[PDB]
Amino acid sequence: KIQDSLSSTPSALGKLQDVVNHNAQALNTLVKQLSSKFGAISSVLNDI
Amino acid sequence: NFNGLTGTGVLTESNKKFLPFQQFGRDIADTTDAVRDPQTLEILDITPC
Numbered sequence: 788k789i790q791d792s793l794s795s796t797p798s799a800l801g802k803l804q805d806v807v808n809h810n811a812q813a814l815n816t817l818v819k820q821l822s823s824k825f826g827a828i829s830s831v832l833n834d835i
Numbered sequence: 836n837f838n839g840l841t842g843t844g845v846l847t848e849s850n851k852k853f854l855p856f857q858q859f860g861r862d863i864a865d866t867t868d869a870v871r872d873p874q875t876l877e878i879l880d881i882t883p884c
């Protein structure tokens with residue numbers, strides 16, 4: 788019945804998927820924050 | 836230096852279908868992923884060395 792409990796419930800391993808999701812979200816936001824101008828004329832040092 | 840856009844990277848023949856009205860392509864975070872030549876209009880992919 789252990790295998791049935793693990794198969795029927797998809798959210799059984801949520802406590803373990805949460806850390807991976809948090810790391811992925813942190814990396815994604817750190818990558819996306821590059822487009823921020825931070826008050827400058829542009830976000831690309833090449834053009835600046 | 837593509838029509839003013841200056842950068843560094845390796846240029847490769849593109850395989851993505853640019854629409855006839857598009858001139859630039861971008862990945863996440865405004866990263867220029869592709870550009871079309873202002874001379875021969877061929878699409879080129881940009882990848883950091």
Ligand SMILES: *[C@@H]1O[C@H](CO)[C@@H](O)[C@H](O)[C@H]1NC(C)=O
Nearest residue numbers: 838871872873874875876877
């Ligand atoms: C620009 O000139 C080059 C060489 O003269 C030629 O190969 C190219 O097709 C020209 N492009 C346009 C858009 O006229």
